[model samples]
Target chain A: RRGALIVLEGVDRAGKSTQSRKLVEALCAAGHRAELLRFPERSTEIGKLLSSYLQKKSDVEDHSVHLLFSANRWEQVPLIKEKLSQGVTLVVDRYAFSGVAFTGAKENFSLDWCKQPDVGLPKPDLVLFLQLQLADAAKRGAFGHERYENGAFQERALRCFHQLMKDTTLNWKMVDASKSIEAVHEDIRVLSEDAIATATEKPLGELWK
Target chain B: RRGALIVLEGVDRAGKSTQSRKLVEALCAAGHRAELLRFPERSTEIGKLLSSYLQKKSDVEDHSVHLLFSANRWEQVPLIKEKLSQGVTLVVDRYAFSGVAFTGAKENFSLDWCKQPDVGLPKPDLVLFLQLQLADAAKRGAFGHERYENGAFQERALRCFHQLMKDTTLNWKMVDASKSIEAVHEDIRVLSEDAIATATEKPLGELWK
Candidate 1:
């Protein structure tokens, strides 16, 4: 069976990276092979553009930024497929969900436009919408000095996230990010194990129809 | 007006590369800025996998191989957009056309499946399809060392190329690869000049539906 693709998604500073890392470690400790891949990967050339866009160092057109973000995931398609074929569990930090939710926060671009470019790329077997309130997220740390890190944008993005979950699959679950770190990790552990088992033999499909 | 994307597409040894190179040179010589980019760029890690696939040292499933080819392009999207935005006429040695045509030759995968992953990739402004007879292509020296380089596959691929062209706004033009090298280059140069001028200032769109 092919490996499971696990995506951890939420607002910034929701402890997503922290939990994703812990999840991978636990999976590895249990004698399973797992790999962590983050979207806006910051490694490939397109990823660099995404980094620039986030940092406000470069101003790409809105549609262009959306495509750049999508390309970042598409760039990792081969590696993701390879690792999965070899039975390595994949833990992706963000994916089409982030692309959809983040870009859908903007005016002019519809959820459909934000979703189209990523249609044929790999779909995550399980998407854990690490649900965190704006207040809770703000409490995690000072806001980042980047575009889309403001309170207003975060407010809108949370709404988009809610809509994304309701409009999509039931596989998406909102974990309470307000919990203690260890407790949150344990919840994700239980959730991931079940998801991995269910998604093991499923064929990869386009994330959004 | 921005520069146009010009793609040279066909099987190996169809003189597409030779003509593509010549066209880039001519565009520059005529006082237009131009850049040449080849797929399976060989310098990147993804390209290395493609090289292995092409060399018969690696065996990948049809979907896997098609994704690798598309990933090779995904990694290049930023660089390509940068150059194009900087007013550089770009010559793509091969693009989605090769991905569709070649992989469509494989069993268990149709042209639609091969082309699906690239649906939203940046579309080329013009595609210079170097058409060659399968018997004649096999006659081209050193053209059949890889898995899909046989006469049967080439014939099937040519048919797929025809179907693939219908979905693109690529200003498609077929060149007789049986023509002499000089004649082929001259035809490409003429078409490229007119195509670039006409396609300038048009925003790029996603390929297929």
Candidate 2:
């Protein structure tokens, strides 16, 4: 009736946020009510804490920050459900995939532990994984000023994202993020349109089954 | 060459604390290097947070507290591994089972999520799940002065614990916690003796594996 939860996933510098924004614009241009949503939303209280951790402004343990990210998403569940029900297409910059991948990339953080708190949350109808080779992604630009933006961590996290893709049965379309921004955006738009068209017809699914 | 990690699990007032102490005493009396340990360890930084939440002195979101409890346990991993390596048998009052059950009992909390953070941590060599009727547990003096000490949450947590038993393949021994203190002590003592004897013979296992 309303929107499709279209999540864009990729390692840092993979152009996920850029593609998500352009995709949202394209959806709106096509006369759909589309909006962009980003994770560690950095707006709410939990988001503030998460942002602090991300910026290294505060030090939180790996497991604690992972759960905080999950909590941030969970806090938005009702709103996401409502918007999707109302036919608003949400282009999400990141979702539970990053929550798991980034945390699981750390030493001693089990992949299973990183995924738990996000279980049972809303499932995306389409996951556009902006696949970026670690070296290619590093060449795109200097890493950002965030906790997980380093080359080493990004390399580990990309590995985890691949493992996640293999484990999950979600409708995932892998886009080579090394492509130009316009090219990636175009691919995302095509998939987003098709996903948005039928998203409401299918009942919302829960993450992790 | 090492000792076993033995955990006692039950609802509030099921005598987990009393029983853990008694079991440790019996282990030592039997000439083993044994010590009593409890979760929400209430000593470390994470444990301090969990203690505040449990005592209701501070408020934490359900997911946050759940991970905190897990962190509380993870923080002790090095010590736990060291003790077991040094052949010091650990008689634990509670462990991952209660962490999962109590949090999973809460509204909107996922049982799977509650169990994730503890995955791959030290698995208990034996779990003595103290079985007690809710009413029977409630009748034992009074519920402890803590957050989840009431009837309703206790009931739900009990169900989760039972579900945990079904899902896990750990060495779990169901004990009739409603029995007389001396009777319960005897049963626990015998089991501890047997478990401790083989503690070093078996390789330590990870939880949820």
Candidate 3:
């Protein structure tokens, strides 16, 4: 009954993927149960469409894609709830916040409009944004592989993300990704351990409240 | 530019399919451009999941299926918009209203919760509710072909439909689906032709507003 839902949010190429895994692996080894899951869970029916859209095999409109992304998370509520009941804190690579920020970066998209489909989802107890400056992020990874990984679009997405983080309802924090990978893991380890300990005593919350 | 969006809503055995096709066939034969489309499209990607769920081949959570149903419609928005813009009066067999009613009828579901994913979809200009008495409905044809077709459940779904019909934002009308098929078609034809004429001068509206 002491499972905390923790999320990692950032622009592409940040070490969210790496840190999330290390944190879960360390947690389990340290005698606490934990697991890691990522969004656009690509094996699902809706997930496959998202992957196809990302790979440019199929086309989805901006508005339609937003709903599809929201549906992907909505469909997994039971799995998440069950995992929590088993006392396993779930570390998410990205979630509803990522969905909103990335999609809202598109021209003529409204942040409020983007929030509609994802409201009332399972709220995260802790959201750590691995904040990396664009220039540093571009230097770290090959930038042009996926659809939204380019510098210009990522800049816009970062703006959307900052707006989302401003909501007082989020248990939001920013970490410097410019630090070494080991150092970043230590920082997240300290924060996530405390989150898991405290959230164990509290109920899972509703997101975007 | 001169087209109207019309929807037919009722319980499973209400004859919307037969009537909608008849109306479209009559409209086209009379030199008016029109077309018929049905909800739970059953061919698109999200649609296949809904079909599998409907057929009991795969299971989906209630909330998940609701959003899937909503996504099925949203994924087709561009096609619906283009059809209207091309001077084609688009006749929908069933739409968001059915989604709301059918899903909301299940125990523990709030109508407000049911409406969330489907709100802001393209609104119907005219909604002719196909009202049929339960005894008349039971006598007309075989039931239990698909999920949610039993009398006990259909009775509950009917309650949900009647409540949804009360929304004045809907240009809702009640038609006696108990009438002969040709007679029901005449009633819809009169309403649909006038709707197309009036809507030509007006803009298309959003749903659940």
Best DockQ goes to which candidate?
3
Instruction: For candidate 1, write residues A146-200 as lDDT tens digits.
Output: 9998888877877788788876643687788778899999999998888778877
| DockQ per candidate | 0.08, 0.25, 0.56
> What clash count goes with each model?
0, 5, 0
- Candidate 2 lands at a TM-score of 0.77
| Stretches of candidate 2 exceeding 4 Å from the true structure | A21-35, A41-72, A103-117, A132-139, A145-153, A163-168, A176-190, B21-33, B42-71, B103-117, B133-136, B144-148, B163-168, B179-190
Candidate 3 structure, TM-score to reference:
0.95
Pairs of colliding residues, candidate 2: A2-A86, A2-A87, A2-A88, A3-A87, A3-A88
- Whole-structure CA lDDT of model 3: 0.86
List, residue by residue over A1-209, the lDDT tens digit for candidate 3: 65999999886777999999999999999998899989988988888999999987888877777888888898889999999889889999999988988888899778887887777788999999998876888688577666786777888889999999889987898888888999999999999999998866878888875
Give per-residue CA lDDT, model 3, range B4-62, as digits (tens): 88998886678899999999999999888999899989998888889999898998877
**C-alpha lDDT of residue B207 in model 2:** 88
lDDT of 1 by residue, B1-209 (tens): 67788889976688877887888888899999998998868776557767887898976545545666776786677887888788888998988888888878777666655665566667788888887765676677765577776667777888888887685455788888888889889888888888788777677655664
Query: Candidate 1 regions off by >4 Å?
Result: A1-7, A17-96, A99-126, A143-160, A182-209, B1-4, B25-35, B40-89, B106-123, B144-148, B152-156, B196-209
Candidate 1 vs candidate 2: the TM-score winner is: 2
- The better-scoring model by TM-score among 2 and 3 is 3
Q: What lDDT score is found at residue B85 in candidate 1?
A: 81
